[PDB]
Amino acid sequence: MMPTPVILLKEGTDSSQGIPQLVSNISACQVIAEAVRTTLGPRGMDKLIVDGRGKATISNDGATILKLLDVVHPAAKTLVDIAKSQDAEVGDGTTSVTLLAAEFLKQVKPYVEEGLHPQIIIRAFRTATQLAVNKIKEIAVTVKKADKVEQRKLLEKCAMTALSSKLISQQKAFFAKMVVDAVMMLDDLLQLKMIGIKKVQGGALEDSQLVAGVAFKKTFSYAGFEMQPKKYHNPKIALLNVELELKAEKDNAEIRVHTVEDYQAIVDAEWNILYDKLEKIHHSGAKVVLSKLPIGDVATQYFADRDMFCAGRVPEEDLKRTMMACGGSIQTSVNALSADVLGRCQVFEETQIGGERYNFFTGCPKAKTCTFILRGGAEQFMEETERSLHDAIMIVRRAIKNDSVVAGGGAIEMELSKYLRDYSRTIPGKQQLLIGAYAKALEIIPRQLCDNAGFDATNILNKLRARHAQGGTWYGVDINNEDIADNFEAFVWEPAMVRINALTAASEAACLIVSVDETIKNPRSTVD
Amino acid sequence: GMNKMVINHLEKLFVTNDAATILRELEVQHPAAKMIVMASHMQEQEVGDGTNFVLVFAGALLELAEELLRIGLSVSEVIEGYEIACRKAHEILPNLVC
Amino acid sequence: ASMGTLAFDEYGRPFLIIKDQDRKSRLMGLEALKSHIMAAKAVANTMRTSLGPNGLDKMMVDKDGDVTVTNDGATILSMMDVDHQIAKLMVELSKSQDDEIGDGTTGVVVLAGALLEEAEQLLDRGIHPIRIADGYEQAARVAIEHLDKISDSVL
Amino acid sequence: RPVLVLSQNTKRESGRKVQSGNINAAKTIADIIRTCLGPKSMMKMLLDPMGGIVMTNDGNAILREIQVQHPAAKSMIEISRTQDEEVGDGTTSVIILAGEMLSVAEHFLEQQMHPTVVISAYRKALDDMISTLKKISIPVDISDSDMMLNIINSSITTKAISRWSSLACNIALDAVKMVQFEENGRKEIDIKKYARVEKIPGGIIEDSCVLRGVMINKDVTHPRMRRYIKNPRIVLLDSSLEYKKGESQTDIEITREEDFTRILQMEEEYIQQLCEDIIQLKPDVVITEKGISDLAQHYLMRANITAIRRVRKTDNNRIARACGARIVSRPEELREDDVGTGAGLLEIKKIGDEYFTFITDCKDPKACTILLRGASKEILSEVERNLQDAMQVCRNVLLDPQLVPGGGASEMAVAHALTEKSKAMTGVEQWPYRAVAQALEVIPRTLIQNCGASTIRLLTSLRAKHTQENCETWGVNGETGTLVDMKELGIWEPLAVKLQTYKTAVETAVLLLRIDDIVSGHKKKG
Amino acid sequence: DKEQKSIVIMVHIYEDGTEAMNGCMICLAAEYPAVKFCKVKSSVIGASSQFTRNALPALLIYKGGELIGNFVRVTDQLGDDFFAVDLEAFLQEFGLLPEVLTSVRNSASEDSDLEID
Amino acid sequence: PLSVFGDRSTGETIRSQNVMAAASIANIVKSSLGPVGLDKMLVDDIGDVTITNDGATILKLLEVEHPAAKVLCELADLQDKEVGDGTTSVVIIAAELLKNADELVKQKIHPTSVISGYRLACKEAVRYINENLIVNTDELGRDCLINAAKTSMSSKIIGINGDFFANMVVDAVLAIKYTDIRGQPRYPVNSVNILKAHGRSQMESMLISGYALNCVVGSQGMPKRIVNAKIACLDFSLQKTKMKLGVQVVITDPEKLDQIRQRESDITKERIQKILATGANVILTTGGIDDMCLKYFVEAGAMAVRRVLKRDLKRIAKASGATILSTLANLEGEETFEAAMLGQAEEVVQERICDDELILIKNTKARTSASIILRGANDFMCDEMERSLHDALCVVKRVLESKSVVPGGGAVEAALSIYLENYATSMGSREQLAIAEFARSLLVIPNTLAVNAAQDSTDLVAKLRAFHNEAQVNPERKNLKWIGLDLSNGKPRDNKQAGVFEPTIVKVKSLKFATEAAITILRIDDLIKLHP
Ligand SMILES: Nc1ncnc2c1ncn2[C@@H]1O[C@H](COP(=O)(O)OP(=O)(O)O)[C@@H](O)[C@H]1O
Numbered sequence A: 001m002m003p004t005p006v007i008l009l010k011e012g013t014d015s016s017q018g019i020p021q022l023v024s025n026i027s028a029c030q031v032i033a034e035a036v037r038t039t040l041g042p043r044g045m046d047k048l049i050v051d052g053r054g055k056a057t058i059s060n061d062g063a064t065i066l067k068l069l070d071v072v073h074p075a076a077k078t079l080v081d082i083a084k085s086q087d088a089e090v091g092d093g094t095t096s097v098t099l100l101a102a103e104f105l106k107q108v109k110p111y112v113e114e115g116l117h118p119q120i121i122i123r124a125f126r127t128a129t130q131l132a133v134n135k136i137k138e139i140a141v142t143v144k145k146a147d148k149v150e151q152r153k154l155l156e157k158c159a160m161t162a163l164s165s166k167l168i169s170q171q172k173a174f175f176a177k178m179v180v181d182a183v184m185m186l187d188d189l190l191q192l193k194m195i196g197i198k199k200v201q202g203g204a205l206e207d208s209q210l211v212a213g214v215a216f217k218k219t220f221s222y223a224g225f226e227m228q229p230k231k232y233h234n235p236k237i238a239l240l241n242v243e244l245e246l247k248a249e250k251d252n253a254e255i256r257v258h259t260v261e262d263y264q265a266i267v268d269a270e271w272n273i274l275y276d277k278l279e280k281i282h283h284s285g286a287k288v289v290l291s292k293l294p295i296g297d298v299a300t301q302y303f304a305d306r307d308m309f310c311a312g313r314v315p316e317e318d319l320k321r322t323m324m325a326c327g328g329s330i331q332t333s334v335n336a337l338s339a340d341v342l343g344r345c346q347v348f349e350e351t352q353i354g355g356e357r358y359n360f361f362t363g364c365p366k367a368k369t370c371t372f373i374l375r376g377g378a379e380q381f382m383e384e385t386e387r388s389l390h391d392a393i394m395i396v397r398r399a400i401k402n403d404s405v406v407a408g409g410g411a412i413e414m415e416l417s418k419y420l421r422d423y424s425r426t427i428p429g430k431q432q433l434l435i436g437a438y439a440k441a442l443e444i445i446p447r448q449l450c451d452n453a454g455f456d457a458t459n460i461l462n463k464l465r466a467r468h469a470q471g472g473t474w475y476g477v478d479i480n481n482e483d484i485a486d487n488f489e490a491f492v493w494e495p496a497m498v499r500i501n502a503l504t505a506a507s508e509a510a511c512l513i514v515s516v517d518e519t520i521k522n523p524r525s526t527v528d
Numbered sequence B: 001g002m003n004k005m006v007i008n009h010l011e012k013l014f015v016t017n018d019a020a021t022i023l024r025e026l027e028v029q030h031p032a033a034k035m036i037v038m039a040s041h042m043q044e045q046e047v048g049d050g051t052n053f054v055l056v057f058a059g060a061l062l063e064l065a066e067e068l069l070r071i072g073l074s075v076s077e078v079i080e081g082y083e084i085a086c087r088k089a090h091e092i093l094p095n096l097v098c
Numbered sequence C: 001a002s003m004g005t006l007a008f009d010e011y012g013r014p015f016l017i018i019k020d021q022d023r024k025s026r027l028m029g030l031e032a033l034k035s036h037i038m039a040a041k042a043v044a045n046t047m048r049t050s051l052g053p054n055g056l057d058k059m060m061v062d063k064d065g066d067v068t069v070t071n072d073g074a075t076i077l078s079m080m081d082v083d084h085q086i087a088k089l090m091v092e093l094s095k096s097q098d099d100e101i102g103d104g105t106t107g108v109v110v111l112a113g114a115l116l117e118e119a120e121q122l123l124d125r126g127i128h129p130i131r132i133a134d135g136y137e138q139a140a141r142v143a144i145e146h147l148d149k150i151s152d153s154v155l
Numbered sequence D: 001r002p003v004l005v006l007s008q009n010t011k012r013e014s015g016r017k018v019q020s021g022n023i024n025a026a027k028t029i030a031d032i033i034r035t036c037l038g039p040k041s042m043m044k045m046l047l048d049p050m051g052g053i054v055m056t057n058d059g060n061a062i063l064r065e066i067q068v069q070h071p072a073a074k075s076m077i078e079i080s081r082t083q084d085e086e087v088g089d090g091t092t093s094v095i096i097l098a099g100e101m102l103s104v105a106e107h108f109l110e111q112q113m114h115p116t117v118v119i120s121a122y123r124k125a126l127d128d129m130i131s132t133l134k135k136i137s138i139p140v141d142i143s144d145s146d147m148m149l150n151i152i153n154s155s156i157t158t159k160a161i162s163r164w165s166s167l168a169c170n171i172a173l174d175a176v177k178m179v180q181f182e183e184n185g186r187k188e189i190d191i192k193k194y195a196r197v198e199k200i201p202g203g204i205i206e207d208s209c210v211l212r213g214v215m216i217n218k219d220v221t222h223p224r225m226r227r228y229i230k231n232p233r234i235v236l237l238d239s240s241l242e243y244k245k246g247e248s249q250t251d252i253e254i255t256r257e258e259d260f261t262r263i264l265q266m267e268e269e270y271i272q273q274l275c276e277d278i279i280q281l282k283p284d285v286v287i288t289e290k291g292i293s294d295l296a297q298h299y300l301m302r303a304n305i306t307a308i309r310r311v312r313k314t315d316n317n318r319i320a321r322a323c324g325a326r327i328v329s330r331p332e333e334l335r336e337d338d339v340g341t342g343a344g345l346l347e348i349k350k351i352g353d354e355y356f357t358f359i360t361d362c363k364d365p366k367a368c369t370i371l372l373r374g375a376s377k378e379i380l381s382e383v384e385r386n387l388q389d390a391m392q393v394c395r396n397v398l399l400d401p402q403l404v405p406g407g408g409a410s411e412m413a414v415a416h417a418l419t420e421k422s423k424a425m426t427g428v429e430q431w432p433y434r435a436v437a438q439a440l441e442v443i444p445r446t447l448i449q450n451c452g453a454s455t456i457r458l459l460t461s462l463r464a465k466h467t468q469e470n471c472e473t474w475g476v477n478g479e480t481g482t483l484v485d486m487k488e489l490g491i492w493e494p495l496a497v498k499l500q501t502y503k504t505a506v507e508t509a510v511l512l513l514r515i516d517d518i519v520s521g522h523k524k525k526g
Numbered sequence E: 001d002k003e004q005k006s007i008v009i010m011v012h013i014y015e016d017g018t019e020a021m022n023g024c025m026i027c028l029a030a031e032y033p034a035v036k037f038c039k040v041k042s043s044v045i046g047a048s049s050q051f052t053r054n055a056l057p058a059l060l061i062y063k064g065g066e067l068i069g070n071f072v073r074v075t076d077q078l079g080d081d082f083f084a085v086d087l088e089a090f091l092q093e094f095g096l097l098p099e100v101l102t103s104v105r106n107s108a109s110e111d112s113d114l115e116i117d
Numbered sequence F: 001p002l003s004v005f006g007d008r009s010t011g012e013t014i015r016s017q018n019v020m021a022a023a024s025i026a027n028i029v030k031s032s033l034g035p036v037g038l039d040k041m042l043v044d045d046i047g048d049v050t051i052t053n054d055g056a057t058i059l060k061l062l063e064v065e066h067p068a069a070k071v072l073c074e075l076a077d078l079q080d081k082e083v084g085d086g087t088t089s090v091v092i093i094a095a096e097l098l099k100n101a102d103e104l105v106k107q108k109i110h111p112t113s114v115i116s117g118y119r120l121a122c123k124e125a126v127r128y129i130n131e132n133l134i135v136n137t138d139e140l141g142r143d144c145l146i147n148a149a150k151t152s153m154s155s156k157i158i159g160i161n162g163d164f165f166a167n168m169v170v171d172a173v174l175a176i177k178y179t180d181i182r183g184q185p186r187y188p189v190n191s192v193n194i195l196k197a198h199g200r201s202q203m204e205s206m207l208i209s210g211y212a213l214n215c216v217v218g219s220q221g222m223p224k225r226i227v228n229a230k231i232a233c234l235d236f237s238l239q240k241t242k243m244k245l246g247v248q249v250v251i252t253d254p255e256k257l258d259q260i261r262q263r264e265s266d267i268t269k270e271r272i273q274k275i276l277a278t279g280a281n282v283i284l285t286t287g288g289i290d291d292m293c294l295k296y297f298v299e300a301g302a303m304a305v306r307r308v309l310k311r312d313l314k315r316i317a318k319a320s321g322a323t324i325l326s327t328l329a330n331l332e333g334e335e336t337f338e339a340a341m342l343g344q345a346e347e348v349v350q351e352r353i354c355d356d357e358l359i360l361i362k363n364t365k366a367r368t369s370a371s372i373i374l375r376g377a378n379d380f381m382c383d384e385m386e387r388s389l390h391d392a393l394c395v396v397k398r399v400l401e402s403k404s405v406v407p408g409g410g411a412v413e414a415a416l417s418i419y420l421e422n423y424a425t426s427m428g429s430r431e432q433l434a435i436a437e438f439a440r441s442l443l444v445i446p447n448t449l450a451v452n453a454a455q456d457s458t459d460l461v462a463k464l465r466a467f468h469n470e471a472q473v474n475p476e477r478k479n480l481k482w483i484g485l486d487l488s489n490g491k492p493r494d495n496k497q498a499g500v501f502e503p504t505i506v507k508v509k510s511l512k513f514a515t516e517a518a519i520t521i522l523r524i525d526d527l528i529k530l531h532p
């Protein structure tokens, strides 16, 4: 290569082409997969990441760990992207997708090094993934009875399986029942914003509770608030979006008077406007008043005089949850405060929870929202508990959409690997090697489970392969018993769509990585 | 054709085998290559496909013109021959419609 | 045991994966467990001298020179200027005990330090830390039930 | 604290880029001296790093002064040096041929052909090239002086010395013939050692001549020495004529009064005895490579003997060859055979502001001095280079009397023969074979380009002409740009020069094709 | 630090008549292959500003790790355009510099040759 | 806690770094394997250029920092020293073995089991090679040597000219042949003086039926051609005599200084007279000769060469029958030189080779000697020809010493892989994986050859493995053991019939050395790097 006084690209452009860059891309993918490798399974371990500001994030979630990793490698970013995709569409399996993709790339690396054309590998991956998805859909177990008790049990088992890998796995039955109960009360859309999650420092995990209603923190009470009663036995709730305090009528309003009588009339008119709003609220029959906009001290004292509870500056989502639980309507004008626009709950009370004051709306019979109040010894403890409960909630929602379950613990992947190997034994032979490599790479998850648990991976792998070969579909890794067992009878259940999405995303990532032959990096502009 | 990993000055990922996108996301400094790139972009604007054809044909034409100049032909003769051959190809093309 | 992993490829080409990977550090597995247990042990041993009627005070000086003499474990750990993450976790544990109860903010730190110190010698013998945590949870449940059993009521 | 396998300053590149870079380096090196070929070539000025100026059009002289960083260019420079050392001509031709073959090889490597196939095709092509060159050669009669002069003229017609063709041709032919030697059944020429070229700036180049003897820039030791001797008997020496310390430590101890004077007198007597031993042979001139004491000069003048001191060893060997003498280190062992008789005149004369010693009438001398007189030092350097080329060509013709048509006629003939041969290959390597065969047309092409005529029409006409039966001697007239039968233009080249050029170009192409990886930056690790 | 103490090694400090002295040094290197002439910029060494401004021509000679010659600012006592032979004579007057041609190369178990039965 | 002033790596990290370093060293030279391989250019920091295909030279010239890479480089150097061929295959095999063993270790297989499996696989591979894949060279004749030389010179700058270079190599090796005690024909390579000189083409390289010296006559007065040469080899300088350190000259009578000074040179004069009086014509000495002694040789019409290399002088003395004399001292305290210490040659000439001269001692008697003059386009080409020629000479020596050869082109590797993958099922439970990985690693050679040839490596190696499996299973298909790779056409081919051989010692030593290097690297699981 010559200096060539006039150059084609910008000076400093870096270009990598050929087999070596593909091998380097595969190695980078393996490096990324290693960073979340040990977080998989009930024996998985958490990872702690410190940012530049010094904040520490402790998480067992693969997607969160990958997000906190500041990857810059163009090929490595695909694994993070597919982890984000799996989190978005499913919510669980973010650790499995990266491992599967990296194992695919590792298995096909020797064939790449020996000059195999990438298109053949891509076609083999597409065929194998299609066959595996069809097999998963075919052998997935579903019950067409719509029995409430067994469907509830299926939801609870799926929640426990999705939860039995986190720091709350000791109380996995308790939190699983809480999560299933919370999800069942969502109405039709299962919107995540309808499940409030409040984290309160202090207290054990068993002290965490689910509220059949809405609960939120106290919001900067004004003077005279402590004179209000803090418990009602059948209150009517006025959900408002109104600023109840003395203020200018309008920002651009101007008052022009030339008589002291008019001055007194103006001040009395302002006071009368405020008192008329408060009087309308009072004769609306409501005992609890909530508002997005601030509620002034004058209004607070007025409500205290009438023995009512008031709370201004309530967050928008909390008022939405209160409206959907008590069954009222958020009002921007108080002129027509009819009976139907007033919320209603059986019991309202303010109670102290770990050094904080919380307002409780319990006893709602037709509530369509929830409120998780999580307790723990550190803010990261509550954060990880919230992440785990989010995973469980997503799993339960997906199970509600379609109750198609497959046994976990790597049993499904053993069945898929056996089926794929059997299929590959009946083709010419160029695709046979690649499909066999795909089937072998499908064994990564149970092997990783055994490695994390401290087992001997080879013996468990051999036993699982022998068990699946001669008959047996749901035989996977049993962590506690140091051996293998029928995971379906052990209630290690997984929605089939989770593994379907995992396989699809891993295959797409592997094909995209393999299809790239050259990498070009333009010099950075405005480095600052 | 294989996809290409392209990183622009803003560190934005690009995987594509589309010639026009690759050319757009390359900091091309040689002005003759700039003319080739803008001809490709004009082809993309007018039709929407065939940009890689434009680059390949232009490159082949330029290398063969360099060979012709080396063997002794003048630039004017090469240009005239290319124009005549392009006219002949345009005349021929309707007869090749299947 | 530090600076992540440095390969620079087997073909001599640059191998950059994580931004500023040369300026970052990483600890894996048992070494990280030992470091965390040591940090928690140091914090607990610092706190344990201020336990009981004969416990002595700690004289805390902030960044502005204001000095505070106190015996409250939560107050001591809150004003302590730590940088180890496990020390911050211990401080947050003491603050949580203060928020929920208001008393015993020093007992929690000492108990956690002792638990991790024993877990260190359990780990040295080849026991998975998850097994240690499960055993600790079972023993904690047993101890809580015993506390409920031997509890006494007052007017 | 980075961990590395190789050094942090070791850079590696491989693949198509390495081959393209090497071939482009060879092409650029060829382009450097592309216009310096043919009778109508132009001069080039080279600024030496030591402040000197080299003004020439020789390919090797131009390439030798160029400092390059790309190792392929270094390989090309070494190729030019090898061609210059082996035969003394064809440096520009071999460089251009190597560049053209490597361009063709790059064309073939752009496709999916492995370099080994191209190398095998190139080697088969080279074998056929050698066969055709040997086939189209013609013999040369050694005793025909006119034919030798014509050959030397065709060799030097492309240089700046072409303005004086007869003079340079006669000088080169006479020097080569008289330096030719035969002893013990072994024939040698030895242009490198004998036939020295001495250049004295000033005068006119028409006064330049080759002496029947030797000439050195030396003066008589004493003014009383004879500066003009008719028939001298030169005696050559290798040792000093002065008292010198012995090898062993030889401290003396003087206790008597007269021992000091006795020691000095014995030094005097030792010098006298050495001079008497020299004189006993009755010579006229004494030449030695080392110093001569003043007492030795006095004793030699007493016998009317001219003495010159401090001559170079090469000059003394040249004098020994010229005057038929033998260099003797110990004067006490001088023999009549060692005395050099055969020099017909010795004369010391003044040229400019210096004294020069002439021994210029030797009968049957085996060494000569070429006295170059010109405008300046650079002009004389160029004339010396041209004379070196002429003498090398004369030696090549004398060793091998085969002769080959020039002006691109041989190139086109070999190309046509190889193209006809390739019609029966019916393989995958026929394409590189035919292409490297046609690559020989660059020499007529660059001849036409330098002449300024129409390249395409002339090459097409020449190719059509070479397709006939008896047309192997049809080249291009480099000064008129017309097709002319070369057996009447008289431009012919020795077969050895063409063979060396072809072989060197083909092997340069092969060597640069054998390469696909480059590593650099590591210490030499002595 | 490296190389044998029995070989005289000199270094030159320069900034971008430096060219003439560099040419003379190249000529001496061609004339003295046993020596390892080399040069290095002052800015690389980061010497003092006075050396950079008034001591541009530096003739530093090392022999076994010690300075047997520290010729600095040789403009006055040597000149500006003197040739390589002048520098050689000047350096050899102080007894510092050291006092056939093959085809190309000859160099290539310890069993040299044995015809013993 | 450790408080060790240095960096520490433990577990998977250090193993991965070692494997990456070994793989990088392998990938450095993987492109110069087999006839379709291509050479590399090495450029120093001072501009020196080296072009070579030999793996050992490439690894020696490179700067290597990682200790495992150093291990591989020294492995290549040892393979070159002990065999002379296969310096690239050994490195590639060792790196592949290390990679597969590391993969097994990552599969939680203990490294001791992998090491035991590798040892068993190496032993069984050596046994199978020695029992099935060897070909006896007694019934093949000179064609076996020619084919071995041609195979060794493939992938080299002298590949296509093999038809001539193999003849040259075989002739030289057979010329330097000698027999020793207990009747073992020994071939002392490195006795063939390889002389380089650029100029005319490779086909003009000359094999000298004698010896060649890279030196000329001391004086221009001596004759440059002697027909009946009586070579006198000396190991002492011929110059003015000088007394030793313990002897000093002190003069008290001034009349004796002239006699002292005369005797000083007359001693050397009389030594030269004694040497010449026996009829010597060519005089070679390791020391120097001054002017007067050169004149003494000139007057007698005899050659005199100074500064002769000691090894060259020893070879000349052995070939011509002369004996080297470090001094002219007999067993009765006198100075003498008998005619018995004179070697003889058919002709001694100073030939001119490309504007330079060298001395050719032609057709020495009482012993046959050989030398090679290599002609190339430039210096780098000549150096590469010399390296390839040395490799070919070593291969021919190995073939002549041990009369067993094996088919080339990856046939041995494929047969070994099939046999080992079949044999691994017989012994052990965890070692079987190690033996299977050894068999898989042995397949890196044909894969690399196919990749270099830009052929379909997968299909070609699959066909080779199928052929060898059929050979091993069917007992009437033993003829398929020789099925190698035809790189020119990219098809399987009977390499034994095609004439592609190589010494069995090459494969055996490569396997043993690669296995030992992989075992050595595999034991490492912790690194401490103290700061300097
Ligand atoms: N009780 C169990 N026994 C064995 N394996 C389990 C059990 N519970 C979960 N798993 C396995 O753990 C894996 C999920 O691990 P986890 O890190 O929680 O989520 P992800 O799917 O994102 O890795 C599943 O593939 C499942 O097979």
Ligand SMILES: Nc1ncnc2c1ncn2[C@@H]1O[C@H](COP(=O)(O)OP(=O)(O)O)[C@@H](O)[C@H]1O
Pocket (backbone or CB within 6 Å): D036, D037, D038, D039, D041, D058, D059, D089, D090, D091, D092, D093, D094, D154, D155, D157, D158, D405, D406, D407, D408, D447, D476, D477, D478, D479, D491, D493
């Ligand atoms: N009068 C002439 N007419 C045409 N061609 C000529 C004439 N004289 C010489 N040539 C050609 O020019 C070439 C000499 O070019 P020259 O400058 O000597 O190159 P180089 O220095 O490499 O030998 C020869 O090959 C010869 O055939």
Ligand SMILES: Nc1ncnc2c1ncn2[C@@H]1O[C@H](COP(=O)(O)OP(=O)(O)O)[C@@H](O)[C@H]1O
Pocket (backbone or CB within 6 Å): F032, F033, F034, F035, F053, F054, F055, F084, F085, F086, F087, F088, F089, F090, F151, F152, F154, F155, F407, F408, F409, F410, F445, F449, F484, F485, F486, F487, F500, F502
């Ligand atoms: N003509 C040929 N056909 C097929 N294979 C060959 C041929 N010549 C050599 N080989 C194979 O190529 C391999 C590489 O040899 P090479 O790398 O040149 O030797 P080294 O390892 O000493 O450098 C050898 O193992 C040999 O079996």
Ligand SMILES: [Mg+2]
Pocket (backbone or CB within 6 Å): A092, A093, A162, A163, A165, A391
């Ligand atoms: Mg999960």
Ligand SMILES: [Mg+2]
Pocket (backbone or CB within 6 Å): B049, B050, B051
């Ligand atoms: Mg298109």
Ligand SMILES: [Mg+2]
Pocket (backbone or CB within 6 Å): C103, C104
């Ligand atoms: Mg207390």
Ligand SMILES: [Mg+2]
Pocket (backbone or CB within 6 Å): D089, D090, D091, D155, D158
């Ligand atoms: Mg010429």
Ligand SMILES: [Mg+2]
Pocket (backbone or CB within 6 Å): F085, F086, F152, F391
């Ligand atoms: Mg070899």
